Write an enzyme that holds these catalytic residues in place. Sequence first.
Site, short mmCIF file in Angstrom:
data_model
loop_
_atom_site.label_atom_id
_atom_site.label_comp_id
_atom_site.label_asym_id
_atom_site.label_seq_id
_atom_site.Cartn_x
_atom_site.Cartn_y
_atom_site.Cartn_z
N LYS A 73 0.87 -1.21 0.00
CA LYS A 73 0.00 0.00 0.00
C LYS A 73 0.91 1.26 0.00
O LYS A 73 1.90 1.31 0.71
CB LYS A 73 -0.89 -0.03 1.24
CG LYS A 73 -1.67 1.26 1.55
CD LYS A 73 -2.75 1.52 0.54
CE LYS A 73 -3.37 2.89 0.72
NZ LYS A 73 -4.32 3.33 -0.33
N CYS B 88 -1.70 12.53 -4.73
CA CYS B 88 -1.83 12.99 -3.27
C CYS B 88 -3.27 13.52 -2.92
O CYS B 88 -4.08 13.81 -3.87
CB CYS B 88 -0.72 14.02 -2.92
SG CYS B 88 -0.87 15.56 -3.85
N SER C 47 -12.21 6.89 -2.54
CA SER C 47 -11.49 7.95 -2.00
C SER C 47 -11.05 7.49 -0.62
O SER C 47 -11.49 7.99 0.39
CB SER C 47 -12.34 9.20 -2.05
OG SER C 47 -11.75 10.15 -1.26
N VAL D 205 -1.77 3.13 -15.26
CA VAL D 205 -2.10 4.35 -14.64
C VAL D 205 -2.71 4.16 -13.27
O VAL D 205 -3.19 3.07 -12.89
CB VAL D 205 -3.07 5.15 -15.51
CG1 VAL D 205 -2.44 5.63 -16.81
CG2 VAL D 205 -4.35 4.36 -15.73
N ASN D 206 -2.64 5.23 -12.48
CA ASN D 206 -3.44 5.34 -11.28
C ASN D 206 -4.91 5.54 -11.68
O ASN D 206 -5.22 5.60 -12.87
CB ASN D 206 -2.90 6.49 -10.44
CG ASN D 206 -3.12 6.29 -8.94
OD1 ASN D 206 -4.20 5.92 -8.48
ND2 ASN D 206 -2.07 6.56 -8.17
C1 LIG Z 1 -9.18 0.63 -2.96
C2 LIG Z 1 -8.06 1.23 -3.80
C3 LIG Z 1 -6.87 1.69 -3.19
C4 LIG Z 1 -5.82 2.21 -3.92
N1 LIG Z 1 -4.69 2.68 -3.35
C5 LIG Z 1 -3.66 3.09 -4.11
C6 LIG Z 1 -2.39 3.43 -3.51
O1 LIG Z 1 -2.30 3.35 -2.25
N2 LIG Z 1 -1.41 3.76 -4.32
C7 LIG Z 1 -1.53 3.79 -5.69
O2 LIG Z 1 -0.51 4.05 -6.38
N3 LIG Z 1 -2.70 3.47 -6.32
C8 LIG Z 1 -3.74 3.08 -5.56
N4 LIG Z 1 -4.92 2.70 -6.15
C9 LIG Z 1 -4.93 2.73 -7.59
C10 LIG Z 1 -4.64 1.36 -8.20
O3 LIG Z 1 -3.29 1.00 -7.88
C11 LIG Z 1 -4.86 1.44 -9.69
O4 LIG Z 1 -3.93 2.39 -10.28
C12 LIG Z 1 -6.32 1.77 -10.13
O5 LIG Z 1 -7.28 1.12 -9.26
C13 LIG Z 1 -6.52 1.35 -11.57
O6 LIG Z 1 -6.42 -0.07 -11.81
P1 LIG Z 1 -7.73 -1.03 -11.92
O7 LIG Z 1 -8.53 -0.57 -13.11
O8 LIG Z 1 -7.18 -2.39 -12.01
O9 LIG Z 1 -8.49 -0.85 -10.61
C14 LIG Z 1 -5.95 2.21 -5.39
C15 LIG Z 1 -7.11 1.71 -5.99
C16 LIG Z 1 -8.15 1.22 -5.22
C17 LIG Z 1 -9.35 0.73 -5.95
C1 LIG Z 2 -5.04 9.43 -3.93
C2 LIG Z 2 -4.12 9.53 -2.78
C3 LIG Z 2 -4.95 9.62 -1.49
C4 LIG Z 2 -3.48 10.79 -2.98
C5 LIG Z 2 -2.94 8.52 -2.87
C6 LIG Z 2 -3.34 7.08 -2.59
C7 LIG Z 2 -4.32 6.62 -3.57
C8 LIG Z 2 -5.67 6.34 -3.21
C9 LIG Z 2 -6.20 6.47 -1.87
O1 LIG Z 2 -5.59 5.95 -0.89
O2 LIG Z 2 -7.29 7.06 -1.75
N1 LIG Z 2 -6.64 5.89 -4.19
C10 LIG Z 2 -6.25 5.70 -5.51
O3 LIG Z 2 -7.09 5.42 -6.40
N2 LIG Z 2 -4.90 6.03 -5.86
C11 LIG Z 2 -3.95 6.47 -4.93
O4 LIG Z 2 -2.83 6.69 -5.40
#
Ligand SMILES: Cc1cc2nc3c(=O)[nH]c(=O)nc-3n(C[C@H](O)[C@H](O)[C@H](O)COP(=O)(O)O)c2cc1C
Ligand SMILES: CC(C)(C)CCc1c(C(=O)O)[nH]c(=O)[nH]c1=O
Lengths: 313, 313
Positions: free
Chosen positions: B44, B131, B69, B194-195
Amino acid sequence: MCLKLNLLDHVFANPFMNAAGVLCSTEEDLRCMTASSSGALVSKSCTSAPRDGNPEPRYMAFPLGSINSMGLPNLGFDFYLKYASDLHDYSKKPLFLSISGLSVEENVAMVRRLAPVAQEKGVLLELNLSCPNVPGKPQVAYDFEAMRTYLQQVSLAYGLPFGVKMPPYFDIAHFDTAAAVLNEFPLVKFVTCVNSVGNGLVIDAESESVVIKPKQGFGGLGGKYILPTALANVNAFYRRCPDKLVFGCGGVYSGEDAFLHILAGASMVQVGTALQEEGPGIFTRLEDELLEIMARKGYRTLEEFRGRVKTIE
Amino acid sequence: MCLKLNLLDHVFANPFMNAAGVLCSTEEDLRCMTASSSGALVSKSCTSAPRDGNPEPRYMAFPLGSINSMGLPNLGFDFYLKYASDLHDYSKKPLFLSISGLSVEENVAMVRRLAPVAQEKGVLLELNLSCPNVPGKPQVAYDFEAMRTYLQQVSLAYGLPFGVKMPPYFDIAHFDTAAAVLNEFPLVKFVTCVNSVGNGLVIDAESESVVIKPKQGFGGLGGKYILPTALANVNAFYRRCPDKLVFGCGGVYSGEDAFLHILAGASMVQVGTALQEEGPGIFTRLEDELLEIMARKGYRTLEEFRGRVKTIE
Ligand SMILES: Cc1cc2nc3c(=O)[nH]c(=O)nc-3n(C[C@H](O)[C@H](O)[C@H](O)COP(=O)(O)O)c2cc1C
Ligand SMILES: CC(C)(C)CCc1c(C(=O)O)[nH]c(=O)[nH]c1=O
Ligand SMILES: Cc1cc2nc3c(=O)[nH]c(=O)nc-3n(C[C@H](O)[C@H](O)[C@H](O)COP(=O)(O)O)c2cc1C
Ligand SMILES: CC(C)(C)CCc1c(C(=O)O)[nH]c(=O)[nH]c1=O
C-alpha cells in the site's frame, strides 16, 4: 407529469438533444434531428472553411462506447449559418450552433456574423472549447490562459448570451480554476459538460491492431466508459457556477442515465454515442424511460429533482 | 509454456501483480499476496506516520468498475520497511514498496531509509506521484515543475533504480511534456501507467445519492471504465521512454485485457479493481487465459508481442 423546460428564453418539450458531432453535419442530418422527438438539436462543430476531416476509419463503437478522431469534418460556417438563417423550422424546436475555429481570430470572425442571426431567429451558440490551439500546446480548455483569451474575444465580438462545451477535468484544482475563469464571463449562460475523454486507445485483440487510423489509434472516448466522469463534471460546474446553466453530455443510454445527469444538475441532456448507435428513435425511448422513473418517485417536473443529488453526512 | 521474465535485475515467474492499494495494507494482506500465484506484489502507498484515511463508505464497486477515496490509510512507513527488511520471503517473488509522502521532504526522508534495505534485500521502489487535494494546487504529476522537483530530490536522496506511478493524461502535449520530464532522470527505470482516473462521480438512481462519503462522493475510477485510457497511457509512455520499462495498470479483468496491455508495451501488468472483487485466485485464471491466447496465436514469449500493437497505414 412533465418534461418541459423553459430556459435561455426558449421553450423545450423535453431536455434531450443530440451531442455536437452526431447526426448533425449535413442538411439531411439536421432535418432528421428536427423530425425526431428530441427537445432541441445542435449542429456539427464548424470551421470557417469546409473540411474533409481525417482519414477513415475514424469512429468505432463497441459495447462500452466509442472512440473517434474525426478531425472536424464539416460543411463550413456558411452552410450552418444558412441552415440557421433560412432552413431551420424554429416552431419545431430550438437550434444550437456549435463553432470550433482553429484560432481565436477564426472564432471571432464566425461569431460576428452569427450575432445578427442569433438576434433575429434565436439560434443559440455553443462554443467548443476543445478547439485545438497551437500544435504542441494542450487543447484550449486545458490551457487556462488561452481559455480566458478566447472567452474575452468572443464575448466582445458576439455580445449575446452563449454557452461553452468543456472537456472533462480530473483534478479538483482544475474544476476550481476552470469554473472561476467561466464565472468571469457573464454572457456565458450555459456550460456543457463533457466532450469526449481525450486520447484513449482501443486495441482489437484478434487483429492486434488499433481500431481507428488517425493519431496511431488515439482518440476521444464516449459512451459507457465516461458516465461517472461526465456526472462529476456536471456536478462540479453546477456547484461552482450557480448563476449559469449546466447541460449534461456523456454516457447517456437510458432515462436512468439522464435522471442521474439531472440529479447532478443537468438542464438539457445531450446524447452522442448512443444516438450514433441507435438512431433518433432513441429520443422516444429516453423520454418514456425518464417519465417512468419520475412517476415511480412521484416527481412531476424536472426542477423538483435537478441538482438534488444527496451526499452522505 | 511458462511466462517467466527478467526486469530490474529480478526474476519474475509471470508478469502479474496487485495494483498498489489493493490487498496490500496489512501483514496479512502481504502474506496473502505472497502466497498467491502472482509474479510480484506491491505494498500500500505509505506515509511517514500511520493514517486512518477517510470516513467509510470510501470504496464501492459495480459491474463496470470501482470508485474510491480511501484517503491513504496505511500502517506507516516503519511497518512497510520492516516488512521489506525482515518479513518478506524474497525466494517467493519480488517486492515493490509504494511511497506517497505528502511533501517532497517526507518522500526524501523515507527514500533515504529505504536505500540500504533496497541494497541489501532487493525491494523495489514505486514512487506514487498522486496525493490528497490541497485547495489552490494541482496533483503533483499534473504540475510539471513540482514533478521535476520531486524527481530530482528523490533521485539524489535514493540513488538507486526506482519507478514512478502516474496518473492518466488525456492530451498529447501533456504526454510529450511528462515523458520529457521523466526522461531527465536515469534512475527512473519504470513508469506505471495508470493510477485511478481522478474525481469521477457515481450516483445511485434508487437512493438519489452518491455512493461514497468523502469528497461529496467524488473519487478515483478503476476497472472497465478505464481500460482504453490505461492502454493509451501505457503506449504513449512506451513510445516516448525507450530506455525505461512501462508497467500497465487499469482495467485488467482477463488474460485478454493483459494481452492488450502487453501489446501496448507493458512489461508487468497490475490488477486493482478486479483483484479487490475476485480475490487472489484471479492470478491463476489470468495466467491461464494469457497463456491460452498466446498458444492460439503461436506466441512463445512475451517479448514476441510486447509493444507490437499495429497501427493502420
Ligand atoms: C481501494 C483502492 C486503493 C488504492 N490505493 C492506491 C495506492 O495506495 N497507491 C496507488 O498508487 N494506487 C492506488 N490505487 C490505484 C490502483 O493501484 C490502480 O492504479 C487503479 O485502481 C486502476 O487499476 P484497476 O482498473 O485495475 O483498478 C488504489 C485503488 C483502489 C481501488
Ligand atoms: C489518492 C491519494 C490519497 C493521494 C494517494 C493514494 C491513492 C488512493 C487512496 O488511498 O485514496 N486511491 C487511488 O485510487 N490512488 C492512490 O494513489
Ligand atoms: C463521431 C463524433 C463526433 C463528435 N464531434 C463533436 C463536435 O463536432 N463537437 C463537439 O463539441 N463534440 C463532438 N463530439 C463529442 C460529443 O459531443 C460528446 O461530447 C461525447 O461523445 C460524449 O458524449 P457520449 O458519451 O454521449 O458519446 C463528438 C463525438 C463523436 C462520437
Ligand atoms: C476535437 C476537435 C477536432 C478539435 C473538435 C471536434 C471534435 C471531434 C472531432 O471532430 O474530431 N471529436 C470529438 O470527440 N469532440 C470534438 O469536439
